[PDB]
């Protein structure tokens, strides 16, 4: 494939501590490329990856313009939601939005998304037909009817099918040496005695991209999933990812245990033992 572009808006009210904060991040697959924070010294859409910095003033001014209008829209939306749910102006509330497009290997739109949450529950969502909405409650039904009336789905369909797909094509080309070039994990097994009778085996995958990875332990075959301590994949802080999988083994059994790594960047699946 792959491939995807996503924007994540967070609009948070903070009564008595100024106006709501608005934060927007843009991703292409597992890589952040743009950010916007209404609490910055001078609000602007800023680059987050090396391949986007090559954009011109018009791109940045244009995006900053769009984010400032969105910030205000979602400031209004917070006031609106407060009357839909009949809540006080004393409490902090949150709107989240995520939208974007997925394209196949040929660059054709596979799937578009546009979802909203209020206080962390699904609020309203664009259906895959890109023409109707699913509303989670009767308050979202009010919003739904407004968007049917305003033909919001038709405007958003055109964005997902046009601009969103066109720009992802540009981004994928401009960042092809990282976004389309896969980073295999560096791997190694460590051995730490717990007691005289037990030892931990930990399998490491470091500096890999994309984030997707499978890391399993086996004992002569087959899987030891229900006994493996697996940490959630984590960012290294340099655009790449980290993961480990641990298993507590009886002393004398360490040679029966194999680690197995699956990742797009590896041409062949890895088998590792402690040495």
């Amino acid at each position: 494939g792959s491939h995807s572009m996503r924007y994540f808006y967070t609009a948070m009210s903070r009564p008595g501590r100024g106006e709501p904060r608005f934060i927007a991040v843009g991703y292409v697959d597992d890589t952040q490329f743009v950010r916007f924070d209404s609490d910055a010294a001078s609000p602007r859409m800023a680059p987050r990856a090396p391949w986007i910095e090559q954009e011109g003033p018009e791109y940045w001014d244009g995006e900053t313009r769009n984010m400032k209008a969105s910030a205000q829209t979602y400031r209004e939306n917070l006031r609106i939601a407060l009357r839909y749910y009949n809540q006080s102006e004393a409490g902090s509330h949150i709107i989240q939005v995520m939208y974007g497009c997925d394209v196949g290997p040929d660059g054709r739109l596979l799937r578009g998304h546009d979802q909203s949450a209020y206080d962390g529950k699904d609020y309203i969502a664009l259906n895959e037909d890109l023409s109707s909405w699913t509303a989670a409650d009767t308050a979202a039904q009010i919003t739904q009817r407004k968007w049917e009336a305003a033909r919001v789905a038709e405007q958003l369909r055109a964005y997902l099918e046009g601009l969103c797909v066109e720009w992802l094509r540009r981004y994928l080309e401009n960042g092809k040496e990282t976004l389309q070039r896969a980073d295999p994990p560096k791997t190694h097994v460590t051995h730490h005695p717990i007691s005289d009778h037990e030892a931990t085996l930990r399998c490491w995958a470091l500096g890999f991209y994309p984030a997707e990875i499978t890391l399993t332990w086996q004992r002569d075959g087959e899987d030891q999933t229900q006994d493996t301590e697996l940490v959630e994949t984590r960012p290294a802080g340099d655009r790449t990812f980290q993961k480990w999988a641990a298993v507590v083994v009886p002393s004398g059994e360490e040679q029966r245990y194999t680690c197995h790594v699956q990742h797009e960047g590896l041409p062949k699946p890895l088998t590792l033992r402690w040495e």
Binding site: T10, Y27, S92, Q96, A117, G120, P235, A236, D238
Partner: protein
């Protein structure tokens, strides 16, 4: 709705005593977004702590990366201090080079 933060303390690169590195604290799976994350050296707060921009997963729960430049040593203990509305008193997680 509330969700308590999952927390991971680790380094950017394999820990090698004396060698430059970055210390990471990764909070994820939390809601609402207000969170107070500090990294420590021997119990005391480190000054220059950068963080990634706030984002969230498919389940709407937020994630953040706090990092700082550090030099690992045989003596110095490093930790992460996290505070959230779901936490009765802050949660400390020590950095372990094997973790």
């Amino acid at each position: 709705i509330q969700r308590t933060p999952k927390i991971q303390v680790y380094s950017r690169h394999p820990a090698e005593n004396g060698k430059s590195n970055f210390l990471n604290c990764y909070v994820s799976g939390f809601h609402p977004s207000d969170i107070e994350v500090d990294l420590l050296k021997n119990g005391e707060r480190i000054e220059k702590v950068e963080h990634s921009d706030l984002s969230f997963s498919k389940d709407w729960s937020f994630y953040l990366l706090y990092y700082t430049e550090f030099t690992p040593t045989e003596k110095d203990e490093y930790a992460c201090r996290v505070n959230h509305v779901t936490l009765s008193q802050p949660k400390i997680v020590k950095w372990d080079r094997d973790m």
